[PDB]
């Protein structure tokens, strides 16, 4: 959470009634005065008194810092890890299926090429035998 224009943590955050962007109060007032009551990033007019709603923070509950030891942070990290693992497993399964299909096609092509090579070797042996017979008979 930070200001849309200032870029830092606002002590008095305000939200636009049309865009919902959180920003600093003084920065929003300066931007409205400079751009004639125009919200930053929007071409629609923004009222300084009506379209800007201040943000009030209640300290009823105990403050939980946004560290890695938080329960919602741990749940979000576990969900992100599960999503990454699921995506990696899906990619690995697709790659394995493609590799298995390619291996089956390569095995079929290798069997066909082995049969063709055996036929070519038999033809070459027959041709060599015929050439040897012609050389022996051709005195």
């Amino acid at each position: 959470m930070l200001c849309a224009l200032s870029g830092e943590i606002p002590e008095e955050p305000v939200v636009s009634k049309k865009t919902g962007v959180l920003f600093e109060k003084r920065l929003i007032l300066k931007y409205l005065e400079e751009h004639n009551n125009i919200e930053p990033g929007t071409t629609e007019e923004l009222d300084p008194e009506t379209d800007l709603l201040p943000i009030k923070t209640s300290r009823v509950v105990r403050p939980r810092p946004p560290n890695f030891t938080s329960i919602p942070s741990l749940l979000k990290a576990f969900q992100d890890e599960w999503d990454a693992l699921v995506l990696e497993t899906y990619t690995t399964r697709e790659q394995l299926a493609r590799v298995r299909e390619e291996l089956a096609t390569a095995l079929y092509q290798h069997d066909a090429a082995v049969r063709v090579i055996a036929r070519l070797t038999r033809e070459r042996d027959e041709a060599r035998e015929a050439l040897a017979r012609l050389t022996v008979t051709g005195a």
Partner: protein
């Protein structure tokens, strides 16, 4: 182009290739066409390992000379192989065959490359499983050592940041308690 395209592709290959042992294994094939194909594949693997040095391969590998083949002859051989090729099975049939292989043979058994289809002896499978377990234990020990070193380096880098964050959290909790006490005191003071 004289070198094999398998090494120039993205398919993994062994770093160390033994030409003599692979040729001796090729000479044991009963089928002459299969034996010639395996011997030429051993020669091509040796030439790929020598001409293209993979990472971790031994240096000084002697290149293997092979006869030059024209592109027209290779195209004619490919056309003859395609004309003599049988009907291509559907992808559903190949998927069913893969599912049957993964159901009959275990996923742990299929994940190891030493599980030969003709190895029916349980002692060889037990020895292969023991070797795979030892290799996995060594890899896990190396990865644990690397992770411990990285964690120690990160802890030495960010211990001050962690201590500052803990001090800030303690100060924020004390400030929240003081703010609650001050709000209660202010309400009581207004009522009084």
């Amino acid at each position: 182009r004289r070198r094999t395209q398998v090494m120039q592709r993205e398919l993994p290959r062994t770093a160390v290739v033994d030409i003599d042992a692979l040729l001796r294994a090729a000479d044991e094939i009963e089928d002459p066409a299969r034996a010639l194909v395996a011997r030429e594949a051993a020669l091509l693997m040796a030439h790929d390992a020598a001409k293209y040095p993979l990472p971790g391969a031994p240096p000084g590998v002697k290149p293997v000379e092979i006869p030059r083949f024209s592109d027209d002859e290779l195209a004619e051989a490919r056309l003859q192989i395609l004309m003599e090729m049988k009907e291509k099975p559907a992808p559903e049939v190949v998927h069913a065959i893969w599912n049957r292989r993964e159901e009959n043979l275990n996923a742990l058994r299929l994940g190891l490359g030493y599980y030969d289809s003709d190895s029916e002896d349980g002692e060889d499978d037990v020895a292969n499983i023991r070797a795979t377990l030892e290799a996995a234990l060594d890899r896990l020990m190396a990865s644990a050592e690397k992770g411990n070193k990285l964690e120690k380096k990160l802890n030495l880098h960010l211990g001050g940041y962690k201590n500052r964050a803990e001090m800030l959290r303690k100060k924020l909790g004390e400030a929240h308690a003081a703010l609650e006490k001050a709000r209660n005191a202010l309400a009581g003071f207004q009522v009084l």
